[PDB]
Design a protein around this ligand. Structure first.
Ligand SMILES: C[C@H]1O[C@H](O[C@H]2[C@H](O)[C@@H](O)[C@@H](OC[C@H]3O[C@@H](O)[C@H](O)[C@@H](O)[C@@H]3O)O[C@@H]2CO)[C@H](O)[C@@H](O)[C@@H]1N[C@H]1C=C(CO)[C@@H](O)[C@H](O)[C@H]1O
Ligand SMILES: *[C@@H]1O[C@H](CO)[C@@H](O)[C@H](O)[C@H]1NC(C)=O
Ligand SMILES: [Ca+2]
Ligand SMILES: [Cl-]
Length: 496
């Protein structure tokens, strides 16, 4: 459960948040595969509640109605088409599995679902699965409201409703079997793994029982005995009785402390400085690297919805965001996930975004297609951070330096640091309010290297900054605190 199952040499997955299956299929072939991306995390592919008030919010997708592969992203045929085309190009698909609950208990009964399925929350009836009152934890939860009221009580966190969402009785073999039936349908289709949504709200033992019911990956694309990659979303910033280490026996876990701390350091909040990143990793109290799924921001905290708070960096903070993603992709700790979002009209009031519910770009509720501009950026309000030169080139950087050790660290005791990955790559950062001009040991073989942040290596020439490494591995770096991107990265494959 701990191996990504990506093609050898591809080290990152990208979250194409709210994308349509047809657009992802095209993206696998025209961009992801050629640029070395390992895989894609897709939004929940199962039928969800169609919410009109507010108008089709992104979060309606986390309120399951059935396990039919029928959503605003497409139907089952389009989904299977996407998985097949992506796999044939070496790009894996990871499914966001919402298995802890069904929709909100206060949702009106009827057929306001993305596939017309009938459901009645009030009487606990979901005939399309089917589930009945016997399949929920209503009689097991002990809070007066029936919802989770206190995260200091590890029991109610698991047996009660997360903000009203009907909680499935995951201890019952019947329920475990319906969930496995759903996941095995996907595995046999060709998915390589899953993001287990709201894992903190499920007992580690119940999750394991479900995982034991899973098939090995489809033998038409994966070697015999391959097990699906599992990463569990468990928000553990300390201070709570539930620890992410309790879930190590099932697979990897999301390390939310990662983005939170990187954000405060790069923003230079309360005395924090980049020189402190010298021992970044377990040294900061993070989970073991081989159990970590890291990221700068996720679909939740980029809109102030999960954990991370005000320190989280997003595409809105473009300049600092590229630097944070750059550091993440160059550093050896964990398995990296790149975020890819859409723009929404943020409207802050008393420090809060009242439009944090806004769903993906659409026309009368129909999600807009991802259009590609002549300069390779996206239109129709899709941000496509994974297509930004600075981010795309660092995804390649991680591939090139994969396996290389963290070495040749340098820092000015403030916010100017640098380090290399074996003799395959080197990166320099300047986050101080003054210029950086120094000769450093890179550990790289002599030659002329193209800086992959400012430009590209276009066969024989660099479109941006060029770095010259001498015979002893030394090279001069000059970065003004006024540079568009205050950092430089060079690697074995950007050499001339
Ligand atoms: C939306 C997510 O809500 C829940 O997350 C909790 C988190 O578990 C809890 O610890 C706390 O963390 C914030 C932070 O606040 C500080 O004041 C404390 O000092 C820290 O110790 C504390 O960690 O609050 C958040 C927000 O309620 C769920 O646990 C998490 O699973 C939810 N995210 C996923 C689930 C659903 C439901 O299907 C989706 O809506 C969402 O898109 C998923 O990512
Ligand atoms: C680099 O570009 C110049 C023109 O700007 C050209 O003269 C030269 O041949 C190019 N180098 C290679 C290796 O193609
Ligand atoms: Ca639960
Ligand atoms: Cl996540």
């Amino acid at each position: 459960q701990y191996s990504p199952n990506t093609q050898q040499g591809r080290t990152s997955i990208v979250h194409l948040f709210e994308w349509r299956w047809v657009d992802i299929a095209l993206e696998c072939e025209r961009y992801l595969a050629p640029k070395g991306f390992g895989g894609v995390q897709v939004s929940p592919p199962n039928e969800n509640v169609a919410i009109y008030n507010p108008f089709r919010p992104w979060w309606e997708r986390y309120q399951p109605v059935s396990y039919k592969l029928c959503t605003r992203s497409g139907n089952e045929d389009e989904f299977r088409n996407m998985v097949t085309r992506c796999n044939n190009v070496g790009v894996r698909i990871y499914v966001d599995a919402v298995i802890n609950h069904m929709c909100g208990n206060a949702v009106s009964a009827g057929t306001s679902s993305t596939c017309g399925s009938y459901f009645n929350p009030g009487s606990r009836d979901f005939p399309a699965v089917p589930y009945s009152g016997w399949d929920f934890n209503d009689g097991k939860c002990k809070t007066g409201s029936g919802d989770i009221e206190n995260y200091n009580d590890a029991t109610q966190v698991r047996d009660c409703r997360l903000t009203g969402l009907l909680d499935l009785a995951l201890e019952k073999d019947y329920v475990r079997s319906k969930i496995a039936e759903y996941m095995n349908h996907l595995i046999d289709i060709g998915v390589a793994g899953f993001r287990l949504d709201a894992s903190k709200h499920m007992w580690p033992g119940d999750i394991k029982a479900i995982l034991d019911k899973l098939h090995n990956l489809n033998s038409n694309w994966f070697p015999a005995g391959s097990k699906p990659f599992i990463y569990q979303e468990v928000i553990d910033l300390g201070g709570e009785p539930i620890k992410s280490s309790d879930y190590f026996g099932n697979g990897r876990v999301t390390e939310f402390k990662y983005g939170a701390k990187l954000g405060t350091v790069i923003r230079k909040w309360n005395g924090e400085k980049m020189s402190y990143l010298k021992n970044w990793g377990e040294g900061w109290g993070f989970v073991p690297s081989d159990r970590a799924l890291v990221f700068v921001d996720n679909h939740d905290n980029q809109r102030g919805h999960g954990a991370g708070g005000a320190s989280i960096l997003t595409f809105w903070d473009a300049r600092l965001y590229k630097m944070a993603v750059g550091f993440m992709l160059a550093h050896p700790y964990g398995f990296t996930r790149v975020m890819s979002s859409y723009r929404w009209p943020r409207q802050f009031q008393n420090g809060n975004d009242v439009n944090d519910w806004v769903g993906p770009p659409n026309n009368n509720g129909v999600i807009k297609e991802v259009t590609i501009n002549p300069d390779t950026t996206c239109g129709n309000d899709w941000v496509c951070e994974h297509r930004w030169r600075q981010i795309r080139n660092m995804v390649i950087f991680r591939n090139v330096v994969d396996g290389q050790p963290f070495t040749n660290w340098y820092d000015n005791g403030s916010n100017q640091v640098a380090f290399g990955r074996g003799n395959r790559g080197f990166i320099v950062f300047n986050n101080d309010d003054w210029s950086f001009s120094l000769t450093l040991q890179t550990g790289l073989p002599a030659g002329t290297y193209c800086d992959v942040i400012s430009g590209d290596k276009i066969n024989g020439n660099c479109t941006g900054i060029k770095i010259y490494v001498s015979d002893d591995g030394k090279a001069h770096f000059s970065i003004s605190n006024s540079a568009e991107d205050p950092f430089i990265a060079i690697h074995a494959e950007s050499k001339l």
